[PDB]
Amino acid sequence: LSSEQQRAFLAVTQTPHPAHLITGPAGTGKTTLLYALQEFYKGRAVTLAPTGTAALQARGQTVHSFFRFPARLLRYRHPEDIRPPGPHSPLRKAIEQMEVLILDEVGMVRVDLLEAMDWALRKTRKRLEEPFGGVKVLLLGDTRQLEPVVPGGEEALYIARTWGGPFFFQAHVWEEVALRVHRLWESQRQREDPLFAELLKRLRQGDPQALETLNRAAVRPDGGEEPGTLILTPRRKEADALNLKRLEALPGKPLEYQAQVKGEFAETDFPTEAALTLKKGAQVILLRNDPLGEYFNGDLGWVEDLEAEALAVRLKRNGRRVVIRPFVWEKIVYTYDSEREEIKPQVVGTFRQVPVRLAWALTVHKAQGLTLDKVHLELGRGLFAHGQLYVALTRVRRLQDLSLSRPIAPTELLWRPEVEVFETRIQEGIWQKS
DNA sequence: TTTTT
Ligand SMILES: Nc1ncnc2c1ncn2[C@@H]1O[C@H](COP(=O)(O)OP(=O)(O)O)[C@@H](O)[C@H]1O
Numbered sequence: 001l002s003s004e005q006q007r008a009f010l011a012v013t014q015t016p017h018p019a020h021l022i023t024g025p026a027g028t029g030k031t032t033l034l035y036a037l038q039e040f041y042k043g044r045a046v047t048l049a050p051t052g053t054a055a056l057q058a059r060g061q062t063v064h065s066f067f068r069f070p071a072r073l074l075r076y077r078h079p080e081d082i083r084p085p086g087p088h089s090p091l092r093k094a095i096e097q098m099e100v101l102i103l104d105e106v107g108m109v110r111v112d113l114l115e116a117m118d119w120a121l122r123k124t125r126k127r128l129e130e131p132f133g134g135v136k137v138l139l140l141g142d143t144r145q146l147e148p149v150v151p152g153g154e155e156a157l158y159i160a161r162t163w164g165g166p167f168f169f170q171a172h173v174w175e176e177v178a179l180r181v182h183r184l185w186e187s188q189r190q191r192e193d194p195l196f197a198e199l200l201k202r203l204r205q206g207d208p209q210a211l212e213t214l215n216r217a218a219v220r221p222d223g224g225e226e227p228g229t230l231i232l233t234p235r236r237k238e239a240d241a242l243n244l245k246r247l248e249a250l251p252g253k254p255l256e257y258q259a260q261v262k263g264e265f266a267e268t269d270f271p272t273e274a275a276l277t278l279k280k281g282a283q284v285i286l287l288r289n290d291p292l293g294e295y296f297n298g299d300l301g302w303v304e305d306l307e308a309e310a311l312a313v314r315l316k317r318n319g320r321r322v323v324i325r326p327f328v329w330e331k332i333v334y335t336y337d338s339e340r341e342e343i344k345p346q347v348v349g350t351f352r353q354v355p356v357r358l359a360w361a362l363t364v365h366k367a368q369g370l371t372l373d374k375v376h377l378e379l380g381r382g383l384f385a386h387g388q389l390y391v392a393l394t395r396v397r398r399l400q401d402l403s404l405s406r407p408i409a410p411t412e413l414l415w416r417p418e419v420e421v422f423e424t425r426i427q428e429g430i431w432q433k434s
Numbered sequence: 435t436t437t438t439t
């Protein structure tokens with residue numbers, strides 16, 4: 001509906017050039033424009049996103065769940081990690097007929113995921129000569145929002161010598177196709193609070209005086225119990241503690257879903273709580289996709305019935321009831337063996353638990369992309385990722401709806417240099433690799 | 435530290 005939305009819709013549908021990017025600050029309407037691209041490209045297009053919450057918000061699915069990529073480092077063009085589907089599988093028949101791939105929240109898309117989408121699309125359509133196999137890809141997202149996640153294994157050494165960085169614009173595909181950049185400026189999520197919107201405009205460039213304005217405006221440590229509030233917190237275990245304190249305020253019998261952890265599985269890598277106490281009405285979020293498709297990762301809901309090795313959840317999207325059973329997680333580490341310059345994956349331990357965690361309080365990574373009614377930001381040991389603070393402050397429409405526990409220190413205004421070179425070289429309208 | 439199955 002917006003002008004820059006309508007002009008970005010046209011610049012993307014009216015030209016047959018693949019590799020477009022529609023970027024802009026948070027709440028400018030990228031994902032809403034995607035809903036319009038979906039109506040334009042009905043049935044011709046698949047909508048993907050890197051995260052489960054962002055995928056549901058965009059009315060699509062995660063990139064891994066579509067291509068069936070393993071949840072590990074997708075080595076460059078490596079047939080052990082990236083594998084094309086079967087000769088007459090229904091996945092194959094979807095890649096072949098499709099012509100548009102809409103990829104939302106492109107900023108959280110790690111370079112190895114994008115480079116795997118390229119190769120996977122080349123091999124299945126057997127156009128190994130053409131980027132993305134001839135699919136017209138439409139990227140949407142923001143690079144000043146959260147960076148892609150890199151675990152401290154040899155994966156970070158593999159990424160740093162094959163791409164030199166984890167961001168999607170460091171993928172080697174951009175040396176074969178130029179990326180066309182369309183920009184949105186005027187904010188729509190915060191169209192009601194213009195000064196909140198422009199406070200957030202100067203915060204995304206890191207204006208320090210625009211931050212002391214924030215610390216005296218929106219600090220209400222008591223902000224965590226006004227009903228209708230969603231608590232954002234950086235670290236997962238911090239969210240566990242806040243979740244349980246709200247959980248003890250419900251008049252139901254609790255169930256303790258003890259996890260069967262095994263092998264060398266660290267506690268810091270725990271997807272959900274190990275003990276995971278849950279009551280008959282708790283607000284949960286689902287962490288794994290249903291092999292039958294009635295629920296997905298990132299699905300918010302509330303418990304209705306819970307039992308020994310299963311429980312039922314009312315999903316908030318469709319208002320329907322699902323029953324979840326314990327999925328099994330597994331930890332992958334990358335070992336340098338043999339004394340050859342090739343690393344190889346290994347599984348060192350499993351974590352069998354019900355794919356559920358409480359969601360009175362959520363991480364910030366699972367909040368990116370969402371429009372929330374009311375948010376309280378509880379800073380634990382602090383901010384550790386790039387764009388993590390900007391994401392937590394932009395989920396609301398009015399400042400009135402945002403709450404801080406402590407005043408932010410400029411200490412927490414992280415920033416990557418790879419992003420500034422990108423944001424500077426796309427001022428021309430194009431990105432082809434340096 | 436955080437995501438993805
Ligand atoms: N043209 C528009 N008119 C009215 N509201 C809009 C418009 N575009 C977006 N919005 C609203 O702004 C909110 C944020 O939009 P969203 O698509 O999330 O932007 P982004 O994906 O860039 O964060 C949504 O709740 C939506 O209703």
Ligand SMILES: [Mg+2]
Nearest residue numbers: 030031369370
């Ligand atoms: Mg969005």
